[PDB]
Amino acid sequence: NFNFNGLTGTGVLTESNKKFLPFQQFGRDIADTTDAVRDPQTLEILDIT
Amino acid sequence: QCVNLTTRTQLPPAYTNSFTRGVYYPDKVFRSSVLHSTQDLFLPFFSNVTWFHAIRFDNPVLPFNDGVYFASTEKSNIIRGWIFGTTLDSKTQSLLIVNNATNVVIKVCEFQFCNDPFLGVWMESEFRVYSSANNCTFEYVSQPFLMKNLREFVFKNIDGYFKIYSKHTPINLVRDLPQGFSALEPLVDLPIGINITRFQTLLALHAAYYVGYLQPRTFLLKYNENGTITDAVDCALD
Numbered sequence: 001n002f003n004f005n006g007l008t009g010t011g012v013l014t015e016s017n018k019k020f021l022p023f024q025q026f027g028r029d030i031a032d033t034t035d036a037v038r039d040p041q042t043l044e045i046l047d048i049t
Numbered sequence: 050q051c052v053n054l055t056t057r058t059q060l061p062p063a064y065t066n067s068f069t070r071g072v073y074y075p076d077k078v079f080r081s082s083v084l085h086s087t088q089d090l091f092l093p094f095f096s097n098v099t100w101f102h103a104i105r106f107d108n109p110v111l112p113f114n115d116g117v118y119f120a121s122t123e124k125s126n127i128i129r130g131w132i133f134g135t136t137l138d139s140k141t142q143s144l145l146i147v148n149n150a151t152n153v154v155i156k157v158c159e160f161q162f163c164n165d166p167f168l169g170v171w172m173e174s175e176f177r178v179y180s181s182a183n184n185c186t187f188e189y190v191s192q193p194f195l196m197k198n199l200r201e202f203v204f205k206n207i208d209g210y211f212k213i214y215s216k217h218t219p220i221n222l223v224r225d226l227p228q229g230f231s232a233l234e235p236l237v238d239l240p241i242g243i244n245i246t247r248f249q250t251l252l253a254l255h256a257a258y259y260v261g262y263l264q265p266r267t268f269l270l271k272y273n274e275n276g277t278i279t280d281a282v283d284c285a286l287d
């Protein structure tokens with residue numbers, strides 16, 4: 001389960017290969033479902049499968 | 050410590066200014082190759098953006114219609130700030146936003162502002178802007194936005210929350226805002242807790258600036274393959 005500084009849901013965690021611009025903390029796919037997230041404290045991108 | 054110039058330059062509060070594709074990122078969400086429809090306050094494209102001459106300092110208190118955009122083009126960073134609130138005459142609180150000591154400093158309080166406020170310049174001083182303040186609500190400090198370079202900002206106040214987004218590029222044309230796509234990055238987010246219906250500009254004295262207004266319209270933001278915005282449409286402008 002997740003609660004990343006308010007972002008919640010469920011999934012399997014693996015490292016992401018999606019880069020975020022300084023403007024964004026979280027990303028979404030086609031149909032707007034959250035996939036990749038930036039860790040609230042660590043500047044790395046994590047994928048929620 | 051005010052200079053007592055009270056220049057009171059008298060020019061109409063209007064200007065033809067070509068302006069297009071000036072948006073801010075509405076969220077912190079990254080989308081690849083997605084056209085995003087967002088309903089928020091943005092400056093309508095080709096809307097009235099008033100250009101004010103300055104030191105003879107043209108700086109009337111102007112209406113804040115939902116929110117505003119500001120921009121200026123000066124190498125020395127002579128314009129140092131903005132003042133926002135219902136009256137700006139010490140009867141209500143206002144938001145004093147300044148740029149000095151290579152940082153951005155914001156204070157929300159009831160300030161005894163001078164009719165033609167200047168930052169002192171050496172030692173710098175805020176007392177040439179206002180003599181005192183009381184009944185204070187909030188303070189905020191952030192990184193400088195400095196880099197003739199153009200500094201474009203959007204100022205919003207939603208239910209007591211104040212936001213600034215900005216973009217900085219070199220500019221050759223200073224008679225009009227530059228054209229082309231520009232998306233602004235968030236700089237501040239404050240619980241100021243006040244009514245902004247009016248605003249005024251703060252200038253350092255040894256200066257001209259643009260100001261527009263926002264409307265609650267749908268914008269189509271065209272996102273690129275890696276989440277940046279490359280274009281924009283102002284819904285029902287024409």
Ligand SMILES: *[C@@H]1O[C@H](CO)[C@@H](O)[C@H](O)[C@H]1NC(C)=O
Pocket residue numbers: 061063064065066067095096097098
């Ligand atoms: C702004 O309004 C004034 C009215 O005095 C007009 O002359 C000017 O063309 C307008 N500018 C734009 C960009 O609409």
